[PDB]
Nucleic acid binder design. Structure first.
Lengths: 94, 94, 180
RNA sequence: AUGAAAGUGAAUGCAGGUGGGAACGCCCUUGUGGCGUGCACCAUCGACCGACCCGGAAGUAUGGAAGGGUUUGAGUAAGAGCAUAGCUGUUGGGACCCGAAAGAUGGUGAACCAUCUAGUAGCUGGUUC
RNA sequence: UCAGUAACGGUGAAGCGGGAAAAGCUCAAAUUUGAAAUCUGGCAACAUUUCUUUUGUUGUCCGAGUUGUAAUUUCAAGAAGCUGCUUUGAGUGUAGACGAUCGGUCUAAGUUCCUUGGAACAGGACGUCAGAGAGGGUGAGAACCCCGUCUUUGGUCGAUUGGAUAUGCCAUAUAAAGCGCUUUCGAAGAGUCGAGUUGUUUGCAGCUCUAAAUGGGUGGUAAAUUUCAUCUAA
């Protein structure tokens, strides 16, 4: 818009995306979280970070104590132990 | 393929199926007909002067100079070594 | 110089009329040919599944259709591609199989069934191929138990050292051939 | 996020304390004052990850941990950015307008012509209620 | 989109991914030696036409052509032997439907009264059509005076053509091809590739040399050589 401009007032005056453990439980479908988080079930949920375009699973954050299997290409050196006491397992994608 | 990412076995672990051999790779194979034709043309056409010069170099055991001179003529070591070996077989054949 | 886009609605409408004219020209047969299920070739995309150019000569041989019949009935053939993992054999095979199952070939020369083409012809219908033959993504697994043997499997025991083993394999192999 | 790169890759402590700190509650039932609480924060700090240095629990030559620095990062420490419009400033396009000789290309005639050209403008002049 | 990234030193890509569009192939390199089976042209007939203007066919003659025209084959292969399934026209009238265009034709309702005005297409009163209230003209702002607009992706009437549908008639069809197998054979493009050298924007070009058959090009590796991968130039 020229009418608001200053000229109309001067007239005359001259590859590896990263995911941390505070976010794995957000990658599930919400019904999977509803029916699998916190329930003492024999079978544990499985998370494939690669299906969300994530290469390496870093370990920042706390975890719920529900066991969960995480499938990943690469993993940070603490991210695996935190899921040990979380009761779930980590196994490595080829 | 150890179901993993790294190593001199790496890859996603599957059952590779033995693929067939395609006719494009056939190139370089010797035909008795063309091998006969090359024999005929070699016997009738003769030799260019530079391989002539190097072969009595083989005859008088002047191998190193001939190898260097053959390298100068063609340009690559493999062409040179391929040249001298076939002339030597000609030398013993004669 | 300066490429302007004032024809963008016009060019879109041209393609629509191109498809409608093309489809109406060959109405009996589907507008879009089928394509195989193929995997993008790189570490960033290799997990995904997309549509390739054509089915390799291995697959037509397995599916029981010659490379000539396939071209006539709308199956594109790719000669450059070669499929090595027998799943890629598989996933393309029933893809050809179900396409043939839903395929109806109108008999030539006044509707006398030849070989096994078809008998009915009133079932002429032009359908989207991606409807009857959609391409699916990778089948992911859900709710698998145990694997506490993988628990003791402490990741870097493979990763850190086998990566070092791979890095030093050349030097190691040179060492073994040296003192031998 | 860090590192030159291989590569590794961030709640200490109600995801902290240390003081303070917003309003509120909270009164002693007045309010004030305090009781607090502590937001943004604020400064400090405890630290948490990478680099740097010393050390090598282990675990398959390889290799890494525990631990020690008061060296390092507009680092983590309970994400705040993305898109659109407007204003203003700046950079580049002819670039607020006007104006210098010149140079090139291709032509016409025995110097001229047309294009490149809206040129080099560090200036002169003008620049609208 | 990668990406103003890699790379170069302001210049400035590409692989991958998404989408538009998709369609594949032909020769040379071997023979048919129990048949040059091939082809242009002259001449006589038969036709056909966007078309008396076009396009062919048959017959015959002549020439081209063994320094190579046909058939088969092109690396995805393929040739030659073996097997049982599958198939098949480089045709010709009629009817109907389908669309393309041109050529033409058909399109609803006030010009009824009063005032102003040179003129009513203005104002007021009373109506009408509307799949038509886009627009233009007519003596001033006209849906109803006119051309048009809408119905119209239509009715009609020609003319051809689109190719399918059915039909009729010839065809020749003693046929060839696809795929189970091989008891194997597989020819594969040279002053070209390449190397050095000079110019110019790795590419190309002049210059001298000049290749090879698992060879050659190209890269991940190694190592400076190597494996490995991928492709088959002239």
């Amino acid at each position: 818009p020229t009418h608001v401009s200053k000229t109309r007032k001067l007239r005359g005056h001259v590859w590896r995306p990263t995911v941390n453990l505070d976010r794995l439980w957000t990658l599930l479908p919400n019904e999977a979280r509803d029916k699998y988080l916190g329930k003492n079930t024999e079978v544990a949920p499985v998370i494939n970070v690669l299906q969300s375009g994530y290469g390496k699973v870093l370990g920042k954050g706390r975890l719920p104590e529900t066991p969960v299997i995480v499938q990943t290409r690469y993993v940070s050196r603490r991210a695996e132990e935190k899921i040990k006491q979380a009761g779930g397992v980590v196994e490595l994608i080829a | 393929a150890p179901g993993l990412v790294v190593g001199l076995n790496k890859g996603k672990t599957l059952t590779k199926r033995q693929l067939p051999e395609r006719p494009s790779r056939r190139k370089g194979h010797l035909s008795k007909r063309t091998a006969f034709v090359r024999s005929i043309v070699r016997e009738v056409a003769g030799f260019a002067p530079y391989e002539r010069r190097v072969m009595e170099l083989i005859r008088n055991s002047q191998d190193k100079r001939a190898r260097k001179l053959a390298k100068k003529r063609l340009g690559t070591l493999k062409r040179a070594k391929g040249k001298i070996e076939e002339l030597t077989s000609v030398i013993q054949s004669s | 110089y300066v490429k302007t886009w004032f024809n963008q609605p016009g060019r879109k409408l041209r393609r629509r009329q191109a498809r409608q004219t093309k489809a109406a020209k060959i109405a009996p047969r589907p507008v879009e040919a089928i394509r195989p299920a193929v995997k993008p070739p790189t570490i960033r995309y290799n997990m995904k599944v997309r549509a390739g150019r054509g089915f390799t000569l291995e697959e037509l041989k397995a599916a029981g259709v010659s490379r000539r019949v396939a071209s006539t009935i709308g199956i594109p053939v790719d000669h450059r591609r070669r499929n090595r993992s027998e799943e890629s054999l598989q996933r393309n095979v029933e893809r050809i199989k179900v396409y043939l199952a839903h395929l109806i070939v109108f008999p030539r020369k006044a509707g006398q069934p030849k070989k096994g083409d078809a008998t009915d012809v009133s079932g002429a219908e032009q359908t989207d191929v991606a409807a009857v033959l959609p391409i699916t993504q990778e089948a992911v697994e859900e709710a698998k138990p145990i694997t506490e043997e993988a628990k003791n499997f402490n990741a870097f025991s493979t990763l850190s050292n086998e990566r070092a083993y791979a890095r030093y394999a050349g030097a190691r192999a040179a060492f073994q051939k040296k003192r031998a």
